[PDB]
Amino acid sequence: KSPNVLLQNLCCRILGRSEADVAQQFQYAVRVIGSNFAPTVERDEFLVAEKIKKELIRQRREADAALFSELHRKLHSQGVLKNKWSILYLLLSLSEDPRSYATLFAQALPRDAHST
Amino acid sequence: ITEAALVRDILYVFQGIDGKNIKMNNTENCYKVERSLRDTAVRLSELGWLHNKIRRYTDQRSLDRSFGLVGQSFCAALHQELREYYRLLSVLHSQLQSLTLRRLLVWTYDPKIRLKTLAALVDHCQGRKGGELASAVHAYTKTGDPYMRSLVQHILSLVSH
Amino acid sequence: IRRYTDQRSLDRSFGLVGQSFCAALHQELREYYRLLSVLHSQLQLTLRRLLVWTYDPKIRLKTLAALVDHCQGRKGGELASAVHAYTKTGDPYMRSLVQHILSLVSH
Amino acid sequence: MIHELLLALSGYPGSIFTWNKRSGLQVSQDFPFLHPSETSVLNRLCRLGTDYIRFTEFIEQYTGGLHGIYLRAFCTGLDSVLQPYRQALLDLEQEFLGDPHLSISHVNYFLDQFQLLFPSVMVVVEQIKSQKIHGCQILETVYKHSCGGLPPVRSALEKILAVCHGVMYKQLSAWM
Amino acid sequence: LVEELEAVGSVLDLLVQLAGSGPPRDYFLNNKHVGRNVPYSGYDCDDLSVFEMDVQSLISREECLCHSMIQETLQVM
Amino acid sequence: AAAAAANLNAVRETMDVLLEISRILNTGLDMETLSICVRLCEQGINPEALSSVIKELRKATEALK
Amino acid sequence: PDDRSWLEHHVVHQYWTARPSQFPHSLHLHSNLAAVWDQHLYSSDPLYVPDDRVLVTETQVIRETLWLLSGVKKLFIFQLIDGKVTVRNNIIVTHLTHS
Amino acid sequence: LQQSLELKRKMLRDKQNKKNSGQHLPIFPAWVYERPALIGDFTALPIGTLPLASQESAVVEDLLYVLVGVDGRYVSAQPLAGRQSRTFLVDPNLDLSIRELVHRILPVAASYSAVTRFIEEKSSFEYGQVNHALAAAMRTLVKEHLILVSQLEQLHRQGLLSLQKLWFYIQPAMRTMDILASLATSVDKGECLGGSTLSLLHDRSFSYTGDSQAQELCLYLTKAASAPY
């Protein structure tokens, strides 16, 4: 749909409450999401796959890091997805271990050496 | 000639099989090409050169009962580790149906060390049986690296059964 | 500004407060690669032969070429007796550039 | 393509593979549609299918003439070990019906654990054929290789031996 | 403002649908000279290029006038 | 049509692959909420910016509980 | 034409009657082994002279086999010549080459 | 070249005499040392007569190959190798303007050739568990270097990477790599192993507080090194 009503669909999905309950959160969400609708950094899905690999090594599951390569194959096999970078970066941002230094290793280029 | 054919050839020399325009030449040296790009290939084929020694050894000694039950339990672990190496290769096969990823150096760099440790391990465990064989696996767990210590102790649990 | 930094990072007598000043003058060398990097990218840029782009810096550089002579001749905590001379200067430019560098230096 | 190979391993070699009864599944064709080193990859895979075809011959004769009901129990256990070689062939075809990009390498990879079972029970079956055993000393020759050393050939023959003793538990109850 | 207007809603319900029926430097755009703010910013020529449009928007009226006084009088003369 | 359903079958596959990757990273999003986030990802989105809101509303689904 | 059209649609009419077979196909090597091998055979120059086959699909074999196994015969495939079974050689699918 | 074989045996004899109940320190096979392709750093057209903005693309491409390893087209990795040390030979007709900047960018490649050989020679059992753990967390710093040049490769394929942008991109990593190369030289020159290279690392982790750029690096390496102790 249109993105502005889709934000409202989000705020009804995650909360068990309707929009009539609390509207401070939706205002603060508008403050966050607005002016961030365009990736101003490089969108290489290759780096994002190699970050899930580092993440699954950090959780000590090498079998999961090696099935991840077959699942990363399946995206290539269909190829119907448009930004492969965004959805895997989103699922990586909400990473969780079912059971330190992370900014020191690889991140996407800032574009301060290019016109944004 | 284009690089994408060479990528297909390189994806077979990891197993220990000649490619098509890259083939094995001089057994105790690496694969030889039939300016920078030509020099890159010799470094990627060394993983398969390491693979040859482990694979030819756990092929032959698995059928031996003159090498004992211990030695065969070592062969189980060696072959079990070789399968896990071919999984990646199958993925890389299907993922292409001109591109390099530094000709897959970033993929190969972590299995390269998992091959080098085994390349030492097959020769320290050569021509031994039983507890004498067990002591030869016992030597390499005196390491500070967590990657190596995680590698050897899996084999050691199987050999001492 | 790069000559001064080229010599002070080799001095162990300039200090670990001189090697924190000179390492807050390494960021001011990197900022000199954050300036023209994009003037170079838009080449295939003319804006009155790029005379606007020598008038936001050439004042950065002017502030940081005064400390490259005034604090050239000091070593150790006697130099942090004279970076406090540029947060009292009247140019509100220089006061706010050094109010940030002295924050890194006073760690 | 990856339904023909699932026939050449099970017998019916086709025109991509030439079978011989002594040792078969020869493949020496050039492929412009595959890679030409696929023949070597296929050879490594072909080692398994040769052994499965030999086992089915030995299973065919009982459940040179022979008398012995041990041969009709040894074979019966050898049937039960070959059912996870049947299931592991159904799984592949079920994948290939839906999946478009899977290739020869998936089968060669996936059936690498049966390049340990089959070559190591091959020497047991060829030992019982080459010097013919049809007495009760077949069981001692089984107990020598059910010691194993590799887990597939260590645990497969343990299934078979209990069934052999189960037929002798009718013999030794009609005795007793 | 609507936060303090909710601390009348039908007017804002009227306004959200009339928000497309409307009409069809000083000393702070890129001031990096005066101020107690840190001068530390990199270049991109897409803060200055929409500072060249802040002048060109004045000039694009003041150039359309020079075209639209001679055409407007040559269509009547 | 029919060719519009074979494409959607090839999209249903891809969504299940992203579903596996979603469940091994153990996101609190179920199949429905993730289908809002994929539509957001189609229009272009910064998931650092979505992730900062989702890390707050998931802690504020339990704040008024 | 109201009866023949329904017949044409909801009955196959292409492995038991004089009509060339059609079916939408999914090409590309992993299921294309018959056509791939045909082109390979022709490129090697036999010299040519094809085999007389009418191209029947996969599931039709399955239905015909099930009827042969149930106890009936004299189907379009698997006829008797004196009471001895005989396989038709006009069968080939878009895969397996019929070897 | 020849000298590493000597070093390893002498330090084997140290632990042979020190313990008289511990026999036979294990060594690696000879092919680990023999092949110069397990390490990283080792026709031509007249490049000078070409336009400037195509010379830039050419040299950026060849230098990118030299960064991880392999001898490039117009930049070659020279076989000096007398101790932690690497030199490079650019073709001597490159335009002087480009050439000065290229020479300014080359020390991070010498400061990678020094890094890869340390992991090879000081991973064996005559250098012990502490040097194992030290080289094993420096190998991770090699991996994270490997991943950046792939983003840069995808960038250069689209005609967007230039020597200016590349020079900007390696500016944060220059300091880290130089600290690593000098540390490797110091451990090699003094024949430090065991705990004598846990004193140097405590000193070097104390040494930097300048930007917390090199501080986080050395603190990570001294935390990794002190687990086997």
Curated annotation (Swiss-Prot), chain A:
Phosphoserine, modified sites: S100
Signal peptide range in chain numbering: none
Expression sites by tissue: Ubiquitously expressed.
UniProt-annotated location(s): Cytoplasm, Cytoskeleton, Microtubule organizing center, Centrosome
Similarity comment text for this entry: Belongs to the TUBGCP family.
Protein's job: Component of the gamma-tubulin ring complex (gTuRC) which mediates microtubule nucleation. The gTuRC regulates the minus-end nucleation of alpha-beta tubulin heterodimers that grow into microtubule protafilaments, a critical step in centrosome duplication and spindle formation.
Oligomer status and interactors: Component of the gamma-tubulin ring complex (gTuRC) consisting of TUBGCP2, TUBGCP3, TUBGCP4, TUBGCP5 and TUBGCP6 and gamma-tubulin TUBG1 or TUBG2. TUBGCP2, TUBGCP3, TUBGCP4, TUBGCP5 and TUBGCP6 assemble in a 5:5:2:1:1 stoichiometry; each is associated with a gamma-tubulin, thereby arranging 14 gamma-tubulins in a helical manner. Gamma-tubulin at the first position is blocked by TUBGCP3 at the last position, allowing 13 protafilaments to grow into a microtubule.
Protein's name in the database: Gamma-tubulin complex component 3
Organism this protein belongs to: Homo sapiens (Human)
Residues included from the entire protein: 7 to 129 of 907
From Swiss-Prot, chain C:
Highest taxon of source: Eukaryota
Extent of the signal sequence: none
Tissue specificity of this protein: Ubiquitously expressed.
Disulfide pattern: none
Localization (cell): Cytoplasm, Cytoskeleton, Microtubule organizing center, Centrosome
Stated family: Belongs to the TUBGCP family.
Subunit organization: Component of the gamma-tubulin ring complex (gTuRC) consisting of TUBGCP2, TUBGCP3, TUBGCP4, TUBGCP5 and TUBGCP6 and gamma-tubulin TUBG1 or TUBG2. TUBGCP2, TUBGCP3, TUBGCP4, TUBGCP5 and TUBGCP6 assemble in a 5:5:2:1:1 stoichiometry; each is associated with a gamma-tubulin, thereby arranging 14 gamma-tubulins in a helical manner. Gamma-tubulin at the first position is blocked by TUBGCP3 at the last position, allowing 13 protafilaments to grow into a microtubule.
Function: Component of the gamma-tubulin ring complex (gTuRC) which mediates microtubule nucleation. The gTuRC regulates the minus-end nucleation of alpha-beta tubulin heterodimers that grow into microtubule protafilaments, a critical step in centrosome duplication and spindle formation.
Protein name in the entry: Gamma-tubulin complex component 3
Residues of the whole record sequence present: 304 to 424 of 907
UniProtKB/Swiss-Prot annotation, chain D:
Tissue specificity field: Ubiquitously expressed.
UniProt subcellular location: Cytoplasm, Cytoskeleton, Microtubule organizing center, Centrosome
Family statement drawn from the similarity comment of this UniProt entry: Belongs to the TUBGCP family.
Pathological condition linked to this protein in its record: Microcephaly and chorioretinopathy, autosomal recessive, 3: A disorder characterized by congenital microcephaly and chorioretinal dysplasia associated with poor vision and nystagmus. Variable ocular anomalies include microphthalmia, retinal folding, retinal detachment, optic nerve hypoplasia, absence of retinal vessels, round areas of chorioretinal atrophy, and attenuated electroretinogram. Most patients have mild developmental delay and mild learning difficulties.
Reported function: Component of the gamma-tubulin ring complex (gTuRC) which mediates microtubule nucleation. The gTuRC regulates the minus-end nucleation of alpha-beta tubulin heterodimers that grow into microtubule protafilaments, a critical step in centrosome duplication and spindle formation.
Protein name listed in UniProt: Gamma-tubulin complex component 4
Source organism per UniProt: Homo sapiens
Lineage of source species: Eukaryota, Metazoa, Chordata, Craniata, Vertebrata
Covered residues, full protein: 1 to 191 of 667
Swiss-Prot record, chain G:
Tissue specificity of this protein: Widely expressed, with highest levels in heart and skeletal muscle and moderate levels in brain.
Subcellular location: Cytoplasm, Cytoskeleton, Microtubule organizing center, Centrosome
Role, per record: Component of the gamma-tubulin ring complex (gTuRC) which mediates microtubule nucleation. The gTuRC regulates the minus-end nucleation of alpha-beta tubulin heterodimers that grow into microtubule protafilaments, a critical step in centrosome duplication and spindle formation.
Summary of subunit composition and partner proteins: Component of the gamma-tubulin ring complex (gTuRC) consisting of TUBGCP2, TUBGCP3, TUBGCP4, TUBGCP5 and TUBGCP6 and gamma-tubulin TUBG1 or TUBG2. TUBGCP2, TUBGCP3, TUBGCP4, TUBGCP5 and TUBGCP6 assemble in a 5:5:2:1:1 stoichiometry; each is associated with a gamma-tubulin, thereby arranging 14 gamma-tubulins in a helical manner. Gamma-tubulin at the first position is blocked by TUBGCP3 at the last position, allowing 13 protafilaments to grow into a microtubule.
Family from the record: Belongs to the TUBGCP family.
Name of this protein: Gamma-tubulin complex component 5
Residues shown, of full length: 210 to 308 of 1024
